[PDB]
Design a protein around this ligand. Structure first.
Ligand code: NA
Ligand code: NI
Ligand code: NI
Length: 279
């Protein structure tokens, strides 16, 4: 049940991936201290629907109350845009950006029935060395995983490569040790948001062989403390680190090519090739 996309579906996925990247490029000048995540949601929703002629997937199909996910600091994923800071018991549920914050914006767009999914970290004003390291190492995990993708590679090499990087980081940088979130994984993506296979980001022995024409996400979540997470049972969605330390994530949607992969959600800012030859 893993789908191999045909040429027409690959072109529809290329368009949807570029649109998802373009939302992130568009929103960047609006991301700064004193801005609400609700404001960012309004700007993205209007851009996606009126300029791109596309659909925000979370709002329309997944039961999410907003168009984008905005995850600040100790929020791991699925942060909900809002206008006011609130609390889940003793845990902060932030909505307004401050100097020193880190923010993940997660974009999922549909254009002519095909999905593009991507996310990136934004550094708000003067961020600490520990928080910059977290963001940077999380991106390195994604980039090193991409360098492993080509036909014939077993899926477990992705999480094994990510975990190798984090173990090396931890050995070499005892001041800045990280853990890998286990509860959330990457996934096949195409005409449906959730397709096979499941792509875990820690060390594993999944024997599923990558094939040209497969499209899936890689989206490692790295914690500054321990790996565990807590789900917000009041809003149903927000995921927090269980220990309250920060968490960072980057995501791309990628196509397996004959010799490597194509990064459908590549941004103009990234020094990563759109097409990797990993052969
Ligand atoms: Na976070
Ligand atoms: Ni996403
Ligand atoms: Ni995803």
């Amino acid at each position: 049940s893993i789908k191999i996309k045909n040429a027409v579906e690959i072109e529809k996925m290329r368009v949807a991936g570029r649109l998802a990247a373009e939302v992130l490029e568009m929103i960047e000048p609006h991301v700064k201290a004193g801005v609400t995540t609700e404001e960012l949601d309004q700007i993205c929703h209007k851009y996606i629907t009126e300029v791109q002629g596309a659909i925000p997937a979370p709002l329309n199909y997944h039961g999410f109350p907003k168009s984008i996910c905005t995850s600040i600091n100790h929020i791991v994923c699925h942060g909900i845009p809002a206008s006011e800071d609130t609390y889940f018991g003793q845990i902060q549920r932030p909505a307004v950006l401050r100097d020193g914050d880190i923010l993940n914006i997660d974009i999922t767009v549909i254009k002519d029935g095909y999905h593009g999914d991507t996310s990136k970290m934004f550094l708000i004003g003067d961020v600490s060395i520990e928080d910059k390291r977290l963001c940077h190492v999380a991106q390195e995990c994604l980039y090193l995983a991409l360098k492993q993708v080509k036909p014939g590679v077993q899926l477990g090499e992705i999480g094994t490569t990510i975990e190798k990087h984090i173990k090396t980081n931890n050995k070499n940088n005892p001041r800045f040790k990280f853990s890998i979130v286990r509860d959330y994984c990457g996934h096949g993506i195409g005409a449906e948001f959730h397709e096979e296979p499941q792509v875990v980001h820690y060390k594993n022995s999944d024997r599923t062989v990558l094939r040209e024409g497969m499209i899936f996400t890689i989206e490692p979540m790295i914690n500054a403390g321990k790996f565990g997470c807590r789900l917000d049972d009041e809003d149903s969605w927000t995921v927090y680190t269980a220990d309250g330390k920060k968490s960072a994530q980057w995501e791309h949607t990628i196509l397996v090519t004959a010799t490597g992969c194509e990064i459908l959600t590549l941004r103009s800012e990234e020094s990563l090739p759109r097409i990797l030859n990993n052969a």
